[PDB]
Each structure stands twice: as C-alpha cells, then as structure tokens.
C-alpha cells in the first residue's frame, strides 16, 4: 500500500524504461479496433 507506490515514484524513470521495454509495439493497422478505418473514411468524406 506504500512500497508498491513509492517504487513507481522514486524510480519512475526506471519504471518508465521498463514499461517501454516491455510494452512497445509498432504501428499495425489490423491490430487496432476493426471500425477505425470506417471513421477514417467517414471524416474525409465530410
């Protein structure tokens, strides 16, 4: 309740680096929501 929250505060740079090493992905079109390209077509048609 305290030791879990001060390691992500006093070492927030190192935890940010660990979260960026564990959870970084490239841009994939199909791995988004399936109706994202539909709204992409709806906005550009105004």
């Amino acid at each position: 309740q305290y030791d879990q929250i001060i390691n992500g505060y006093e070492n927030y740079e190192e935890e940010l680096e660990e979260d960026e090493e564990q959870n970084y992905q490239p841009f994939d079109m199909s791995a988004e929501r399936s109706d994202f390209e539909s709204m992409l077509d709806d906005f550009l048609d105004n």
Partner: protein
C-alpha cells in the same frame, strides 16, 4: 463452498490493499457489468444481504460458473464496506461512517498478487 474465518479475513486484507491500487469495483450494477465485460478478476459476495433476487441471478451463475467468473463468500456487508474503504475508515485515531456495500469486484490486483493467487488456488478445491 465452506468459507473459513482466515480466508475471509485475508480477503478483507486484499480488499483493503486493493482499494489503494484503484482496482476495486464496488457497486451492484458495476459488478454486473464487470461480469459482463470479463474484467471481473474476482467478485466478492456477502451472504447476509436481505434482498436475494439479484443474489439468485448471481447464484444462477455461481453453481454453473464460466472460465473467467470467480466468486467467493464472506460474512457481513458492513464489514465488506469497511474493508473496501467505504463503510468505516477505522485507523488508530480516525473514524467516518458510510453505509456498507454488498458486492465488491477486484479489477486490478496490485500488492496482493500472490495473496489472490493462493486464494484462487484454495477456492478451486
């Protein structure tokens, strides 16, 4: 199944340490829609709730659970609201009284990962 005093007290410690992770879903329609989305990594039930129709909707899913529906019983509703941080906040010097809750859903585990792991490995027997 049969619930022990140690399991319920340990689960209340899990709720007191999982409220502070902002991973507790406390509310009956919140519990129903957390069971609907599959985000309910634990639903906690109180066996001393006066109304029982919503309990019988829950107990229709308790005798035949799914693969992602864990359920567990405790004794009191006001004690569940106490250890969910809603009902009473009693520390060494402070007190504040709210009406306690019936069902509390653990969404994020946090500092009680191994605690919830052995609780889920104890309920399955």
């Amino acid at each position: 199944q049969t619930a022990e005093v140690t399991i319920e007290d340990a689960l209340k410690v899990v709720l007191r340490t999982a409220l502070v992770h902002d991973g507790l879903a406390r509310g009956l329609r919140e519990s129903t829609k957390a069971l609907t989305r599959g985000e309910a990594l634990l639903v906690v039930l109180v066996s001393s709730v006066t109304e029982a129709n919503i309990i019988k909707l829950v107990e229709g899913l308790a005798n035949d659970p799914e693969n992602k529906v864990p359920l567990i019983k405790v004794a009191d509703a006001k004690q569940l609201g106490e250890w969910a941080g809603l009902g009473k906040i009693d520390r060494e010097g402070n007190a504040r009284k709210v009406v306690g809750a019936s069902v509390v859903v653990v969404k994020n585990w946090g500092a009680e990962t191994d605690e919830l792991s052995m609780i889920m490995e104890h309920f399955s027997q």
